[PDB]
Design an enzyme around this catalytic site. Structure first.
Site, PDB file in Angstrom:
ATOM      1  N   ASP A  66      37.917  46.842  35.665  1.00 31.99           N
ATOM      2  CA  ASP A  66      37.931  46.557  37.097  1.00 31.99           C
ATOM      3  C   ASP A  66      38.225  47.854  37.832  1.00 31.99           C
ATOM      4  OD1 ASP A  66      37.512  43.843  36.674  1.00 31.99           O
ATOM      5  OD2 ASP A  66      39.599  43.331  36.560  1.00 31.99           O
TER       6      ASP A  66
ATOM      7  N   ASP B 274      42.340  48.072  34.370  1.00 32.40           N
ATOM      8  CA  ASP B 274      42.317  48.068  35.837  1.00 32.40           C
ATOM      9  C   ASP B 274      42.644  49.460  36.381  1.00 32.40           C
ATOM     10  OD1 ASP B 274      42.198  45.009  36.063  1.00 32.40           O
ATOM     11  OD2 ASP B 274      44.031  45.359  34.885  1.00 32.40           O
TER      12      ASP B 274
ATOM     13  N   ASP C 157      41.482  43.704  29.643  1.00 29.16           N
ATOM     14  CA  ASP C 157      40.647  44.613  30.451  1.00 29.16           C
ATOM     15  C   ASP C 157      41.447  45.863  30.816  1.00 29.16           C
ATOM     16  OD1 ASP C 157      42.383  44.053  32.604  1.00 29.16           O
ATOM     17  OD2 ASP C 157      40.802  43.191  33.858  1.00 29.16           O
TER      18      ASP C 157
HETATM   19  N1  LIG Z   1      39.355  40.896  38.316  1.00 31.88           N
HETATM   20  C1  LIG Z   1      40.440  40.736  39.113  1.00 31.88           C
HETATM   21  N2  LIG Z   1      40.404  39.955  40.227  1.00 31.88           N
HETATM   22  C2  LIG Z   1      41.477  39.789  41.033  1.00 31.88           C
HETATM   23  N3  LIG Z   1      42.670  40.377  40.795  1.00 31.88           N
HETATM   24  C3  LIG Z   1      42.851  41.184  39.703  1.00 31.88           C
HETATM   25  C4  LIG Z   1      41.717  41.405  38.779  1.00 31.88           C
HETATM   26  N4  LIG Z   1      42.147  42.230  37.802  1.00 31.88           N
HETATM   27  C5  LIG Z   1      43.445  42.510  38.073  1.00 31.88           C
HETATM   28  N5  LIG Z   1      43.877  41.883  39.203  1.00 31.88           N
HETATM   29  C6  LIG Z   1      45.240  41.970  39.818  1.00 31.88           C
HETATM   30  O1  LIG Z   1      46.019  42.938  39.123  1.00 31.88           O
HETATM   31  C7  LIG Z   1      47.073  42.330  38.372  1.00 31.88           C
HETATM   32  C8  LIG Z   1      46.665  42.378  36.908  1.00 31.88           C
HETATM   33  O2  LIG Z   1      45.627  41.423  36.651  1.00 31.88           O
HETATM   34  P1  LIG Z   1      44.907  41.230  35.220  1.00 31.88           P
HETATM   35  O3  LIG Z   1      44.178  39.926  35.233  1.00 31.88           O
HETATM   36  O4  LIG Z   1      44.070  42.440  34.847  1.00 31.88           O
HETATM   37  O5  LIG Z   1      46.193  41.076  34.261  1.00 31.88           O
HETATM   38  P2  LIG Z   1      47.033  42.253  33.532  1.00 31.88           P
HETATM   39  O6  LIG Z   1      48.459  42.090  34.003  1.00 31.88           O
HETATM   40  O7  LIG Z   1      46.322  43.562  33.758  1.00 31.88           O
HETATM   41  O8  LIG Z   1      47.043  41.819  31.967  1.00 31.88           O
HETATM   42  P3  LIG Z   1      45.727  41.784  31.011  1.00 31.88           P
HETATM   43  O9  LIG Z   1      44.603  42.333  31.871  1.00 31.88           O
HETATM   44  O10 LIG Z   1      46.044  42.613  29.803  1.00 31.88           O
HETATM   45  O11 LIG Z   1      45.523  40.320  30.676  1.00 31.88           O
HETATM   46  C9  LIG Z   1      47.276  40.919  38.913  1.00 31.88           C
HETATM   47  O12 LIG Z   1      48.540  40.829  39.609  1.00 31.88           O
HETATM   48  C10 LIG Z   1      46.055  40.676  39.795  1.00 31.88           C
HETATM   49  O13 LIG Z   1      46.453  40.331  41.125  1.00 31.88           O
HETATM   50 MN   LIG Z   2      44.253  43.840  33.408  1.00 31.33          MN
HETATM   51 MN   LIG Z   3      41.502  43.008  35.798  1.00 26.99          MN
END
Ligand SMILES: Nc1ncnc2c1ncn2[C@@H]1O[C@H](COP(=O)(O)OP(=O)(O)OP(=O)(O)O)[C@@H](O)[C@H]1O
Ligand SMILES: [Mn+2]
Ligand SMILES: [Mn+2]
Length: 330
Positions: free
Chosen positions: A254, A196, A194
């Site tokens: 997100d 963020d 995703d």
């Molecule tokens: N939908 C969500 N709900 C709650 N927390 C989130 C969400 N998206 C991101 N986060 C927060 O931001 C950080 C990144 O989360 P995410 O699940 O997007 O993983 P990422 O490190 O961006 O890797 P990828 O998304 O590529 O799997 C985490 O530490 C989490 O606390």
């Molecule tokens: Mn992410």
């Molecule tokens: Mn996310």
């Protein structure tokens, strides 16, 4: 020679032990599927040690002195070095329980408890879920509708296009409001599941009502397939319709709004990695007596909140050397 906490050491994006860490992470993930949270954390920690090493592990000698390398994780690496394969990891990969739990939990809006419930009820495939729409939330229905695209890694090029439309919508809704890329892409990842974004405004309170206006703007451009707005920070967990040359791709995005007073804590929390942040919070509580979260840093004895202007401020206050986002890939 290597510090115990992931937040006390740099962990770069690329490393020399990808086979070994991947195998340990399969076992961590499988443990989480079974509700075995201790075992999950133990395997995750061992994998993260391998990520921080400056050289490949070629012989079991190189395990010496390393923290969080107990008997089980050591055996897994030993089998991989000696035999090229670990029987326990291969059994997990081939198991219907693991494959199904991975299938279900990767659907937008499905966690481990929902996936396990469905497993126990005899559901196995995506078609099984589509045959029981009364069992699905609207979010999960959207996840199923777009599951092929949502399984396709999101690319940096997708991120750049998405950041442009989000920045345009934010700028037109409220001049001066800002958009910051967070998550794995801020840590330097080339691909992800995703995108963020963290939204704020330099004047506390000017962010009120911003997100719905941003969403209206994006909706009217045809860019939104699914939106769930929730007044924790105000947030919108979305599926965007990203145009591409000759086609389009659904992409999970997100959007989080934080008041600027909390922005450093929010940026730190949302940048991850998930293990890095877990370790940083465990460190804060255990070593410094402070409770850290995405909103602030609280001293429970004094009943005070730390005023931070930057992530650097927070690291300094916890007595940690600063790690930029690309070194938080624990
Ligand atoms: N939908 C969500 N709900 C709650 N927390 C989130 C969400 N998206 C991101 N986060 C927060 O931001 C950080 C990144 O989360 P995410 O699940 O997007 O993983 P990422 O490190 O961006 O890797 P990828 O998304 O590529 O799997 C985490 O530490 C989490 O606390
Ligand atoms: Mn992410
Ligand atoms: Mn996310």
């Amino acid at each position: 020679w290597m510090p115990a906490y992931a937040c006390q050491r740099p962990t770069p994006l690329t490393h020399h032990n990808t086979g070994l860490s991947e195998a340990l992470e399969i076992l961590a993930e499988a443990a989480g599927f079974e509700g075995s949270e201790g075992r999950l954390l133990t395997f995750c920690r061992a994998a993260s040690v391998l990520k921080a090493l400056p050289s490949p592990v070629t012989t079991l000698s190189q395990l010496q002195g390393l923290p969080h390398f107990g008997e089980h994780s050591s055996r897994v690496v030993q089998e991989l070095l000696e035999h090229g394969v670990c029987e326990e990891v291969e059994r997990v990969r081939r198991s219907e329980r693991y494959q199904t739990m991975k299938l279900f939990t990767q659907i937008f809006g499905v966690g481990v408890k929902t996936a396990d419930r469905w497993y126990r009820e005899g559901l196995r495939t995506l078609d099984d879920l589509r045959e029981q729409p009364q069992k699905l939330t609207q979010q999960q229905k959207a996840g199923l509708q777009h599951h092929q695209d949502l399984s396709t890694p999101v690319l940096r090029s997708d991120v750049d296009a998405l950041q442009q439309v989000v920045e345009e919508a934010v700028g037109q809704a409220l001049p001066g409001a800002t958009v910051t890329l967070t998550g794995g892409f801020r840590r330097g990842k080339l691909q992800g599941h995703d995108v963020d974004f963290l939204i704020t405004h330099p004047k506390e309170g000017q962010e009120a009502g911003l997100l719905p206006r941003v969403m209206c703007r994006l909706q009217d451009q045809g860019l939104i397939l699914y939106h769930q707005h929730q007044h924790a920070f105000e947030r919108s967990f979305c599926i965007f319709r990203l145009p591409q040359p000759g086609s389009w791709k659904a992409v999970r995005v997100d959007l989080v709004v934080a008041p600027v007073s909390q922005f450093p804590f929010a940026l730190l929390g949302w940048t991850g990695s998930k293990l890095f942040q877990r370790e940083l919070r465990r460190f804060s509580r255990k070593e410094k007596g402070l409770w850290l979260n995405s909103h602030g840093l609280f001293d429970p004895e004094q009943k005070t909140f730390f005023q931070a202007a930057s992530e650097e401020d927070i690291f300094r206050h916890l007595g940690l050397e600063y790690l930029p986002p690309e070194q938080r890939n624990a």
